[PDB]
Amino acid sequence: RAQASGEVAQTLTQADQQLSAQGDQVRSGLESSVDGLSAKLASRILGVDV
Amino acid sequence: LADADAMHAKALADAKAESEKVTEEAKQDSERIAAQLSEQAGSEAERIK
């Protein structure tokens, strides 16, 4: 059980590092759309093209 | 008195035989218990994973 907990902790830390890096990567992709998404939302609230 | 000697020897021999049988059964049951605990350890490790 201790060995299983240790290996689970190891894979958890590895996955945490990998997911943090991959989220840092996908941050640029999200920022690539942020502007168009904001424009679309503004147009939707106004009921007309922004 | 003689019979008593024969009965003491027979009791010692029977005690030795029964001790051998009891320890054999105990070793078998100990192996079964160890197998059960190892399988439970595998199950616990799988649950943790």
UniProtKB/Swiss-Prot annotation, chain A:
Protein name: ATP synthase subunit b
Lineage, uppermost ranks: Bacteria, Bacillati, Actinomycetota, Actinomycetes, Mycobacteriales
Subcellular location: Cell membrane
Subunit (UniProt): F-type ATPases have 2 components, F(1) - the catalytic core - and F(0) - the membrane proton channel. F(1) has five subunits: alpha(3), beta(3), gamma(1), delta(1), epsilon(1). F(0) has three main subunits: a(1), b(2) and c(10-14). The alpha and beta chains form an alternating ring which encloses part of the gamma chain. F(1) is attached to F(0) by a central stalk formed by the gamma and epsilon chains, while a peripheral stalk is formed by the delta and b chains.
Residues of the full protein shown: 115 to 164 of 170
Family: Belongs to the ATPase B chain family.
Positions with biased composition (Polar residues): 8-25
Protein's job: F(1)F(0) ATP synthase produces ATP from ADP in the presence of a proton or sodium gradient. F-type ATPases consist of two structural domains, F(1) containing the extramembraneous catalytic core and F(0) containing the membrane proton channel, linked together by a central stalk and a peripheral stalk. During catalysis, ATP synthesis in the catalytic domain of F(1) is coupled via a rotary mechanism of the central stalk subunits to proton translocation. Component of the F(0) channel, it forms part of the peripheral stalk, linking F(1) to F(0).
Source organism per UniProt: Mycolicibacterium smegmatis (strain ATCC 700084 / mc(2)155)
Region described as Disordered: spans on this chain: 7-33
Curated annotation (Swiss-Prot), chain B:
Subcellular location: Cell membrane
Origin: domain of life: Bacteria
Other observations noted: Binds 2-aminothiazole antibiotics, which are antitubercular agents.
Complex and partners: F-type ATPases have 2 components, F(1) - the catalytic core - and F(0) - the membrane proton channel. F(1) has five subunits: alpha(3), beta(3), gamma(1), delta(1), epsilon(1). F(0) has three main subunits: a(1), b(2) and c(10-14). The alpha and beta chains form an alternating ring which encloses part of the gamma chain. F(1) is attached to F(0) by a central stalk formed by the gamma and epsilon chains, while a peripheral stalk is formed by the delta and b chains.
Protein family per UniProt: In the N-terminal section; belongs to the ATPase B chain family. In the C-terminal section; belongs to the ATPase delta chain family.
Stated role: F(1)F(0) ATP synthase produces ATP from ADP in the presence of a proton or sodium gradient. F-type ATPases consist of two structural domains, F(1) containing the extramembraneous catalytic core and F(0) containing the membrane proton channel, linked together by a central stalk and a peripheral stalk. During catalysis, ATP synthesis in the catalytic domain of F(1) is coupled via a rotary mechanism of the central stalk subunits to proton translocation. This fusion protein includes a component of the F(0) channel (subunit b) and of the F(1) subunit (subunit delta). Two copies of subunit b and one of delta together form the peripheral 'stator' stalk which links F(1) to F(0).
Protein name: ATP synthase subunit b-delta
Organism: Mycolicibacterium smegmatis (strain ATCC 700084 / mc(2)155) (Mycobacterium smegmatis)
Covered residues, full protein: 51 to 99 of 445
